[PDB]
Amino acid sequence: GNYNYLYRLFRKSNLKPFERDISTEIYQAGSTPCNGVKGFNCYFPLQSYG
Amino acid sequence: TKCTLKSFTVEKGIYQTSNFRVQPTESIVRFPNITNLCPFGEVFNATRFASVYAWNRKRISNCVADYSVLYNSASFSTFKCYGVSPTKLNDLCFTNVYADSFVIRGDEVRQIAPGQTGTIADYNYKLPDDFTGCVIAWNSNNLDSKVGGNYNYLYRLFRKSNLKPFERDISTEIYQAGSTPCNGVKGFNCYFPLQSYGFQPTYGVGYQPYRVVVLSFELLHAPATVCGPKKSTNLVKNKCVNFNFNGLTGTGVLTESNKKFLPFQQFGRDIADTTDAVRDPQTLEILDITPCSFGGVSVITPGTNTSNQVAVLYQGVNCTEVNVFQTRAGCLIGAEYVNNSYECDIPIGAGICASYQSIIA
Amino acid sequence: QCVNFTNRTQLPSAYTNSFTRGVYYPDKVFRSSVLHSTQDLFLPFFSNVTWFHAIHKRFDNPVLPFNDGVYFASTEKSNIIRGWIFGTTLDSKTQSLLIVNNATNVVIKVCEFQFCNYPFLGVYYMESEFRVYSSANNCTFEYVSQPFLNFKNLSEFVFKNIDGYFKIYSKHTPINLVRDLPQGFSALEPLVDLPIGINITRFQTLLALHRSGWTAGAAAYYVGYLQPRTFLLKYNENGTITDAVDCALDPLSE
Ligand SMILES: *[C@@H]1O[C@H](CO)[C@@H](O[C@@H]2O[C@H](CO)[C@@H](O)[C@H](O)[C@H]2NC(C)=O)[C@H](O)[C@H]1NC(C)=O
Ligand SMILES: *[C@@H]1O[C@H](CO)[C@@H](O)[C@H](O)[C@H]1NC(C)=O
Ligand SMILES: *[C@@H]1O[C@H](CO)[C@@H](O)[C@H](O)[C@H]1NC(C)=O
Ligand SMILES: *[C@@H]1O[C@H](CO)[C@@H](O)[C@H](O)[C@H]1NC(C)=O
Ligand SMILES: *[C@@H]1O[C@H](CO)[C@@H](O)[C@H](O)[C@H]1NC(C)=O
Ligand SMILES: *[C@@H]1O[C@H](CO)[C@@H](O)[C@H](O)[C@H]1NC(C)=O
Ligand SMILES: *[C@@H]1O[C@H](CO)[C@@H](O)[C@H](O)[C@H]1NC(C)=O
Ligand SMILES: *[C@@H]1O[C@H](CO)[C@@H](O)[C@H](O)[C@H]1NC(C)=O
């Protein structure tokens, strides 16, 4: 299983053309903020290919 | 004026150079009253659940599907979806919602997935390969755990063949693992398929019950009776703002209207089929739509060989929305209205002319 | 509890002229002192409308096709007509619609039911005869509303089905003629949309049977047929349709 490449599954806002996002920060997918720590309704923005 | 004329010298005259447009201030989005919520209290928060092979199918139809309360509840252990965005659930519309509930153990939650092959999926509830919907589960240790035994919640362990997608089996036939001839009578190699769970107070994480209620959506050609919540913001009047009256978007000025709308009319149109009155959905009031104060902008100038002074005319615009004179042709800025009368030098309109003596009107 | 009727007398249906009746509001748009021309499925002026009677001993309970939209009028008193039926086959094969008005409310159930050959109601001289369907299997949609009800009140009705939107239109029209339509003009204001989106081809009317043998009241109801065409509707100062013109009636109207 190769897991060396990852894709930005979740992002807060859209991307402009020819603009790259490398901000490996947390996604607040719930009403309660993650507070900068991974937890419920909070995962890594990049998911490795299966 | 130089830029519009594409020249660095301007002859004496009046030239239209741009268009004045009163820009909108805010955006107003209003909708009918938010009532008739989906009765999810008796579906997700009921008292008694059902076995996984006998999941209770409840139809959630013709109600505004509010998903914020379901999504933001801290009592639900995990919110997982496969084919839909969890945060886009408010903007979606469906023909109907399939609300199904059952009970499974802690390690059986992974089995609730499209195409997963487990001890429950092949014989109790099997999903298609393009399933839609989010699965809500929670730990029920506070209520389901009983010392005497929670044997009420059963599960179909074995069956002759694998289940087709979305199949419910209520039969109680005897399983036949071997070649021994059984006719519904148990024996050495013939036993009852349905078994009890193992929810006990001593058991910890990984051996705890998880009540699972699953929502499924069908998007057939039937009209979207099920939809999401709408937000109705505050109402502004006598101001040029954007408005959204049940999808009738646009820009205009809303005032109190004396028009007597009939009890079913939501919009009012004039001779040229332009909306000029709307019935407000939240509180039934008639609001006249007056177009925002637009008009051409004309620059009154003498020749650049004479002076660089200019006067600006806002055609058809009252002076309160823009050396300030109110001509019937519009608001005039930069020209002083004298009481004398001369030959017309630069025509403004409606009997008013402009001349350079300072620019006078 | 399906029951046959073996006391039917045979007589052909009557006929009349639709006059200047059957105008309904095309949409929910207010219009004042403007002559709006609209292309919509309307009941043609001076058309041929089929007339059915009930008298005591005649009993007219047909199953007519819906076509593309059916006009329905009933010069009636004492509430002989109390509902309608809609559906293609009206049995356990295809889904039907049920409309029943009684002392509680109007019932609008979109259910696949097995109807009788002759469904009916009962008024024994109060309703205590609930024999419409002998069985009930499934239901998918259901709605609840408020009741809509020398003859005094003529209750016009217009029904349509565009993309499954089962629009229902009506208006309360005072009358004095015992048998025929009045001479005048009255637009039909909408009631409610029914976005059900199922197959509808035929319809049927439910009658309230009287008992003194089964008694029949003095009833007179109409079944008009809507056709696609253009109308010139004149709107008054207050926003109601006070005059209409059928563009395809005769050259002067055109
Ligand atoms: C009332 O009469 C109708 C027709 O006169 C009956 O409908 C037929 O009933 C026979 C007897 O079972 C069936 O073989 C036919 O197939 C029926 N016709 C159709 C078109 O299906 C009806 O059954 C009678 N009602 C009762 C309660 O007997
Ligand atoms: C269960 O969920 C419903 C969904 O809205 C909610 O109204 C109800 O308050 C919940 N039950 C409890 C005990 O909070
Ligand atoms: C709808 O909401 C408005 C806002 O206060 C309220 O005044 C009104 O009574 C509500 N109901 C109806 C039927 O308009
Ligand atoms: C209506 O049509 C029927 C036959 O379909 C005919 O007998 C009747 O005379 C017609 N009536 C009018 C007013 O045209
Ligand atoms: C009216 O019809 C409904 C249909 O279910 C029934 O429940 C109700 O009892 C009826 N009303 C009377 C007065 O019988
Ligand atoms: C309709 O009812 C029959 C039995 O009454 C049942 O077998 C069938 O599954 C039902 N269909 C639906 C769509 O509910
Ligand atoms: C509706 O019913 C008619 C007659 O029963 C049939 O010809 C038609 O194919 C049906 N349409 C659908 C979409 O079922
Ligand atoms: C229009 O309304 C006025 C009252 O504002 C009334 O006097 C008049 O009769 C109405 N006209 C029609 C045609 O309804």
Residue numbers in the entry:
A (entry chain C): 447 to 496
B (entry chain A): 299 to 620, 641 to 675, 691 to 694
C (entry chain B): 14 to 69, 77 to 145, 153 to 176, 185 to 247, 257 to 298
Task: Provide the authors' original text about this structure.
SARS-CoV-2 utilizes a trimeric spike glycoprotein for attachment to the host cell receptor angiotensin-converting enzyme 2 (ACE2) and for the subsequent cell entry step which involves the fusion of host cell and viral membranes. Given its crucial role in the viral replicative cycle, the spike protein represents an important therapeutic target and is a critical antigen in host immune responses. All emerging variants contain defining mutations within their spike proteins, with multiple mutations clustering within the receptor-binding domain (RBD) impacting both ACE2 binding and antibody neutralization escape, while mutations within the highly antigenic loops in the N-terminal domain (NTD) across these variants reduce antibody neutralization. Given the rapidly changing mutational and antigenic landscape of the SARS-CoV-2 spike protein, a structural understanding of spike protein mutational effects and the discovery of broadly neutralizing epitopes is of importance.
To this aim, ectodomains bearing variant spike mutations were used for cryo-EM structural studies. Global 3D reconstructions were obtained at resolutions ranging from (2.25–2.5 Å), yielding open trimers with one RBD in the up conformation and 2 RBDs in the down conformation for all spikes. The resolution within the NTD and RBD was insufficient for accurate visualization of mutational impacts within these domains, due to high degrees of conformational heterogeneity. In contrast, we were able to confidently model sidechains close to, and within the S2 domain, owing to its limited flexibility. Additional mutations were visualized within the Beta and Gamma variant spike proteins, with implications for inter-protomer and intra-protomer contacts. The T1027I mutation lies within the Gamma spike S2 core and the bulky hydrophobic I1027 sidechain faces inwards, increasing the hydrophobicity of the local buried environment. This may decrease the local dielectric constant, enhancing the strength of the nearby network of interprotomer salt bridges between E1031 and R1039 on adjacent protomers and thus stabilize the Gamma variant trimer.
